[PDB]
């Protein structure tokens, strides 16, 4: 009897739409979370291929062996890289060279491009960059004097995964083994030996070891990851990762909104039934049993079908995604299941708790006659408490990331603006007179029930804001990535260029059908002090390195300028904003630089937001033109070539002093990473927008189900199809237009905070969004409403369906 009753209820339109909406929300969250987690894990695995290590530890001196012994006990793979640059002698030809001592583990991941291939640093053997023995006039299989050792030339070093770009290079690379450090006889406890430690293993082992090692550190050793040597390519990966998390969060938020409204409607549908049960003497025990049994059965069925649908979606999508993926992604973690079931349960309980207690403490006749229900838990106190609980739970789930806080700030501004604008709109419309009949009907319907209208409007605004925020963020990220790697780019660099040699090469570049590029003149030095305080002692990478300076007459085109004014005058130099922040310096600070016994002083007058991602060289300091003539003015240029190399030989004969660097390997490396990240963003955006559209359809269907009785009465009276379709069009168009207008402000605020705090991109108020979001939202809502109303009005004996 009870089973047949439950099944009959489950076939009623109201319960049916509630179940469908809940199941769709669960499928939404589960599938999106699973896809996001698997794809991010695949991205991390891909990133492991260019680092030879999952995590990196950096220090200027040897760490105690106890930590590495613990890591080995912790079942972790450890590699070591402890080297710097020093002098070498190819007989009697001194030459600076950057050596690199690595253990047999390295390369732990990836591949070591060598000529001939398949060579590793062994005792008594060294591998050298082609420029190195091109200048040293030695060949493979010969012997080279390094420090106080004579080691055989095993082969060349075409490329290594942990190379970076380093446009301001000085000396080539010399691969060599960790065990032969002492035999060099040239290593000194002076300059940093660039102590780097690579750790690899499962996520749990790495996390536990990191937590174990966190208190055992000093402010000279940094634990990090996705930060390659030299070039900061991995930063892009990091950005992508954040985006993925954001996407998941967005879906979650969307789901919550739908569930809320759906469940609210469901609760209302039960009102009269509870009254009847209270009339028949149903005690508290039996009433609780029946009502919460129906609620729990609905929740369980919705969860089950949602899980099944989400799993089916995930499997079919990953099958259909075989060409895009480079390899099968690892299985997802379990946290999406929590992220779905827990949110649906908690939102359901939060929405349904108040009506349950309210009904349990009100005489049935008051409920039936729509009279004054018991004044318990007023909305003015219930709503803030619910919002606080929800946001606290969201903080717990997310982990206190700035993404959640930015989203919440946007949502709060959106809600406040929504209330104000709704009140103003009601006041305006109460005094407004129209002429079109469908418009009059829509306006009257919107005005008659203000609070329900406001709830619907707020939900739609939230959905539109989330979608628009995601779309704009995707556009900005794609534009930034496209700008980072132009389709054509100089694949060759020229360094160690004398000033008087600038004119010849240019002509040669003009001669050999090559477009010349910028000619940044570089001077290497070290800052002596800031505000007369000797900087020796502060832990900054800038202090223990040869800083590079340049002088530009005009504004740097590709380098944006944010703070200060351009150009800096005498004894004033534009500086990078990030370096100023990490160095805690202000404008006009007395900074003196020591180089070639020509220590010159300058001030600070402008800060430029410099992105360390483009292949174009970037300088922390841009001195005024002709300010450091005493220092040796080196020159550096770049050009792109794609066919043959004989002209390269001609240039080498022409200027054997000038060094030539190829970066085709680096371009190949970055291209795959960029392509994979872009595919990730495209797929995530498509999935989220489609499923958000589905949730919007669900919300609109529920909203129309609310107005079912009025529509049925209208049809019975004899309203034509055209009139009903037009009225629904107009009503939902106004609703969507206002909702999108509010969502524009909300999305702008959240996006501004997110860019200023997470993705470090400049924020510009885009009126194009202001004009696109409201119109598009109104059109979408009108389309959905018209279609669903046309579907509903069709049929016969509609008057009989009024009772349902």
């Amino acid at each position: 009897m009870i089973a047949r009753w439950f099944w009959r209820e489950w076939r009623s339109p109201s319960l049916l739409i509630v179940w469908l909406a809940l199941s769709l929300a669960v499928a939404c969250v589960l599938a999106l979370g699973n896809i996001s987690d698997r794809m991010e894990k695949g991205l991390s695995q891909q990133s492991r291929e260019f680092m030879a290590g999952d995590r990196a530890l950096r220090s200027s001196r040897e760490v105690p062996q106890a930590w590495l012994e613990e890591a080995q006990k912790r079942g972790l793979k450890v590699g070591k890289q402890l080297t710097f640059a020093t002098m070498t002698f190819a007989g009697d030809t001194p030459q600076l060279a950057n050596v690199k001592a690595v253990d047999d583990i390295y390369p732990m991941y990836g591949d070591l491009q060598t000529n001939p291939p398949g060579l590793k640093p062994q005792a008594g053997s060294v591998l050298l960059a082609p420029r190195l023995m091109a200048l040293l006039n030695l060949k493979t299989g010969d012997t080279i004097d390094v420090g106080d050792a004579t080691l055989r030339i095993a082969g060349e070093v075409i490329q290594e995964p942990d190379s970076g770009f380093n446009p301001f290079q000085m000396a080539p690379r010399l691969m060599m083994n960790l065990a032969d450090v002492d035999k060099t006889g040239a290593v000194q406890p002076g300059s940093r030996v660039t102590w780097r430690y690579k750790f690899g293993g499962n996520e749990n082992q790495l996390d536990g070891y990191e937590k174990w090692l966190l208190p055992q550190l000093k402010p000279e050793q940094r634990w990090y990851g996705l930060e390659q040597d030299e070039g900061a390519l991995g930063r892009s990966m990091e950005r992508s990762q954040q985006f993925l998390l954001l996407s998941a969060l967005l879906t979650l938020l969307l789901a919550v909104a739908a569930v809320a409204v759906a469940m609210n409607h469901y609760c209302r549908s039960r009102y009269d039934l509870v009254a009847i049960l209270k009339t028949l003497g149903a005690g508290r025990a039996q009433l609780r049993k029946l009502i919460v049994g129906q609620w729990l059965m609905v929740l369980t069925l919705s969860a089950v079908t949602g899980g099944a649908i989400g799993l089916l979606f995930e499997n079919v999508l990953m099958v259909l995604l075989k060409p895009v993926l480079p390899a099968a992604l690892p299985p997802a973690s379990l946290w999406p299941w929590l992220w779905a079931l827990g949110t649906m349960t908690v939102i359901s309980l939060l929405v349904g708790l108040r009506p349950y207690r309210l009904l349990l403490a009100t005489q049935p006749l008051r409920v039936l006659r729509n009279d004054v229900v018991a004044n318990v838990w007023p909305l003015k106190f219930y709503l803030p408490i619910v919002s606080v609980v929800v946001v606290l739970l969201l903080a717990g789930l997310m982990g206190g990331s700035m993404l959640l806080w930015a989203v919440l700030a946007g949502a709060v501004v959106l809600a406040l603006l929504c209330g104000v604008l709704g009140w103003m709109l009601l006041n305006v419309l109460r005094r407004m007179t129209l002429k079109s009949l469908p418009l009059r009907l829509a306006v009257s319907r919107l005005l008659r029930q203000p609070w329900s209208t406001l709830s619907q409007l707020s939900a739609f605004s939230l959905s539109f804001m989330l979608l628009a925020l995601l779309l704009v963020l995707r556009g900005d990220l794609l534009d930034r990535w496209q700008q980072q790697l132009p389709p054509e780019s100089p694949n060759y660099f020229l360094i160690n260029i004398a000033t008087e040699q600038v004119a010849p090469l240019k002509a040669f570049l003009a001669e050999h059908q090559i477009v010349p590029e910028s000619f940044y003149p570089v001077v290497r030095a070290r800052l002596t002090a800031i505000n007369d305080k000797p900087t020796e002692g502060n832990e900054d990478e800038a202090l223990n390195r040869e800083l590079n300076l340049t002088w530009q007459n005009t504004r740097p085109d590709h380098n944006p300028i944010v703070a200060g004014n351009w150009p800096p005058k005498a004894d004033e130099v534009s500086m990078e904003e990030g370096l100023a922040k990490r160095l805690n310096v202000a404008l006009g600070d007395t900074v003196t630089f020591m180089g070639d016994t020509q220590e010159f002083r300058a001030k600070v007058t402008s800060l430029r937001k410099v992105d360390w991602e483009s292949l174009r060289p970037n300088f922390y300091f841009i001195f005024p033109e002709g300010a450091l003539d005493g220092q040796p003015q080196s020159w550096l240029t770049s050009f792109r070539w794609e066919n043959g190399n004989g002209m390269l030989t001609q240039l080498n004969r022409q200027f054997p002093t000038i060094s030539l660097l190829d970066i085709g390997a680096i371009l190949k490396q970055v291209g795959q990473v960029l392509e994979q990240v872009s595919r990730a963003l495209e797929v995530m955006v498509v999935l989220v927008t489609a499923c958000g559209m589905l949730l919007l359809l669900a919300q609109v269907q529920v909203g129309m189900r609310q107005r079912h009785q009025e529509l049925v009465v209208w049809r019975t009276l004899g309203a034509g199809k055209k009139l009903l379709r037009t009225t629904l069009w107009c009503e939902f168009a106004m609703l969507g237009f206002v909702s999108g207008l509010v969502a524009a402000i909300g999305a702008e605020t959240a996006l501004a905070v997110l860019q200023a705090k997470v993705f470090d991109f400049p924020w510009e108020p885009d009126w194009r969004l202001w004009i696109v979001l409201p119109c598009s939202g109104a059109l979408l809502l009108s389309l959905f409403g018209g279609w669903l109303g046309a579907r509903l009005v069709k049929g016969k004996a509609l008057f009989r369906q009024f009772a349902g």
Partner: protein
């Protein structure tokens, strides 16, 4: 035309398979302009079903139904809805009042559908409702009212329709002798003035006696009583 309603061999059954049940087993009925026909019968004889099928709210199993010279079995839903809006007024058993809007909007509805100005329709509905004896419950919701008030609201809506043909299901179901008498006087005055044909399914013997013709529904058949 003079033949307002023509019904030939009307048959209607409901249910599916074992649940199939026959209600109308061959019905014939011809009415002229301005006539007043009261319909009586035992409970569950199908009177409401016959009334619904007469007004084109649904479709019979088989037969010929013509209203104002239009064969109701030969147009789609839209033409039927247009005809209903043009000519017919209806009063149901449960009155299907919209619980969201107050009484005034419920009475206002048909005038807005016709296409009058909002103020004109508002004052007209107000005058009609005051005429029906409900001038003190204008803003009440349908739940707030009582059975008699809800019935009078439905009657007010039908009257505001100002129809050529008026169908009623128990106009005086929830009314005493006094309010029932006033309602009957209202209906018959309307018939005398506007010449509106009146079909009503009633249980009161007085109202049937006042009516021009009395038809009893037995075994899905029509029998003249007087």
């Amino acid at each position: 035309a003079e033949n307002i309603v023509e019904v030939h061999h009307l048959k209607k059954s409901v249910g599916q398979g074992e649940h199939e049940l026959s209600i109308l087993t061959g019905v014939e009925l011809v009415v002229k302009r301005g006539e007043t026909i009261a319909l009586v019968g035992e409970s569950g004889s199908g009177k409401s079903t016959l009334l619904a099928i007469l007004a084109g709210l649904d479709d019979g199993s088989s037969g010929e139904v013509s209203l104002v010279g239009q064969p109701l079995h030969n147009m789609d839903e839209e033409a039927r809805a247009k005809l209903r809006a043009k000519h017919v007024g209806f009063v149901f058993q449960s009155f299907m009042l919209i619980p969201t809007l107050n009484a005034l909007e419920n009475v206002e509805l048909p005038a807005l559908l016709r296409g009058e100005s909002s103020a004109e329709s508002r004052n007209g509905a107000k005058a009609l409702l005051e005429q029906l004896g409900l001038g003190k419950r204008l803003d009440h919701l349908p739940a707030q009212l009582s059975g008699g008030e809800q019935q009078r609201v439905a009657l007010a809506r039908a009257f505001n329709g100002r129809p050529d043909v008026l169908f009623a299901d128990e106009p005086t179901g929830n009314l005493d002798r006094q309010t029932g008498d006033k309602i009957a006087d209202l209906l018959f005055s309307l018939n005398r003035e506007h010449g509106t044909t009146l079909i009503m399914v009633t249980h009161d013997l007085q109202l049937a006696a006042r009516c021009d013709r009395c038809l009893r529904l037995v075994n899905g058949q029509l029998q003249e009583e007087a």
